[PDB]
Amino acid sequence: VRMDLSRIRNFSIIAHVDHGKSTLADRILELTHAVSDREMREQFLDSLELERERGITIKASAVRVTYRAKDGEEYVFHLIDTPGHVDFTYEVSRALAAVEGVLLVVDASQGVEAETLAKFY
RNA sequence: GUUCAGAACGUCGUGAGACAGUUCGGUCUCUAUCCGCCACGGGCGCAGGAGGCUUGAGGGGGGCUCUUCCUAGUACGAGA
Numbered sequence A: 001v002r003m004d005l006s007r008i009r010n011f012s013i014i015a016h017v018d019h020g021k022s023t024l025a026d027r028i029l030e031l032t033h034a035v036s037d038r039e040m041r042e043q044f045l046d047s048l049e050l051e052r053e054r055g056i057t058i059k060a061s062a063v064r065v066t067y068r069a070k071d072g073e074e075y076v077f078h079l080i081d082t083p084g085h086v087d088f089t090y091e092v093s094r095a096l097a098a099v100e101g102v103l104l105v106v107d108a109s110q111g112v113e114a115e116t117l118a119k120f121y
Numbered sequence B: 001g002u003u004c005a006g007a008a009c010g011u012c013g014u015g016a017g018a019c020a021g022u023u024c025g026g027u028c029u030c031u032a033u034c035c036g037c038c039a040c041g042g043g044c045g046c047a048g049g050a051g052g053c054u055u056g057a058g059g060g061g062g063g064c065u066c067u068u069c070c071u072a073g074u075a076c077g078a079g080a
Ligand SMILES: Nc1nc2c(ncn2[C@@H]2O[C@H](COP(=O)(O)OP(=O)(O)CP(=O)(O)O)[C@@H](O)[C@H]2O)c(=O)[nH]1
Pocket: A017, A018, A019, A020, A021, A022, A023, A042, A043, A055, A056, A057, A058, A083, A084
């Protein structure tokens, strides 16, 4: 994106089990994409469709934004945040201490849990 | 089916013959009367003569099951 040196960042939205770790970065980001009747449907992000059995997303790869800032940094920051629940963390940890910071909304129902403490460690 | 003659082995029986030992083909009788019943009645009553309507103790009857897909995939459940 021509965005030479400077800018960019590292943020991730990690949380406990079943928390819609694929809600925030779903769409309608103004960036314009995923449509034509073939929208990324519920739980986009490639995946494999096979997970349709229960939308049990394995990992979160790719999915980067571009423009959306009221005339600012434009777009400089990752967007990878594998979901799950202590089922791939360790193995997928490779992405844990990869991008600084990690977003994630607490479940209004179950709420915070273990995955929260361990996820912070 | 075995529980009658056949014959059959097998086998006991000195044999005649037999065996809850099996096997193989071995005649099944049916014009209703009372009660009983499904109706269908014929009489008479039910008490000014009729005709049409009906309400109904009383009996019946059938008196069903499940999947799917609901809300919401939420309470809880660490997920499942
Ligand atoms: N009623 C309701 N449903 C929500 C809410 N947020 C997310 N969801 C629903 O719950 C589903 C799961 O949320 P989401 O975290 O994005 O998916 P996931 O839990 O990460 C499944 P995986 O971990 O495999 O990616 C979503 O399909 C979405 O429809 C909410 O605030 N209210």
